[PDB]
Amino acid sequence: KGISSSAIPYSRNAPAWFKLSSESVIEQIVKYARKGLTPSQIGVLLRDAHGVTQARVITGNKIMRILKSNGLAPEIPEDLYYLIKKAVSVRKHLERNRKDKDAKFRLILIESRIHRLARYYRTVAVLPPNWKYE
């Protein structure tokens, strides 16, 4: 296993070429989220197009905070959502052709990786306990 990560800069009064305001950023963010875009995708879209560095350093607060602050928050965290729907897609594929024991092994690993952050999220209680795999 190796490293593949972004290295956010030492600057935090970013970025001094930013002509744009700090309210149109929040406007674009709520536009994209009520268009139905996950936090990662709204971040990358306004990173590329309406070029921000990151909204946590242009606005004073991260985008999950401003999504909750504008009443648009998710009901499950993004990672658990993506990993759940990956689990249901691999389950649908194995249900279609049940001989794929490699998909069985991968499904065991995917469900274990579900249970990891599931019990993490129960211990921190972002989504409430009694919760076990929808």
Binding site: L37, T38, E75
Partner: peptide, 22 residues
């Protein structure tokens, strides 16, 4: 393109309206 038909609480509002109207 990569919009979602899930994942948001206003989307659980629209789908509870769905699951009570149907």
């Amino acid at each position: 393109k990569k919009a979602k038909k899930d994942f948001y609480r206003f989307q659980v509002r629209e789908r509870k309206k769905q699951e009570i109207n149907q």
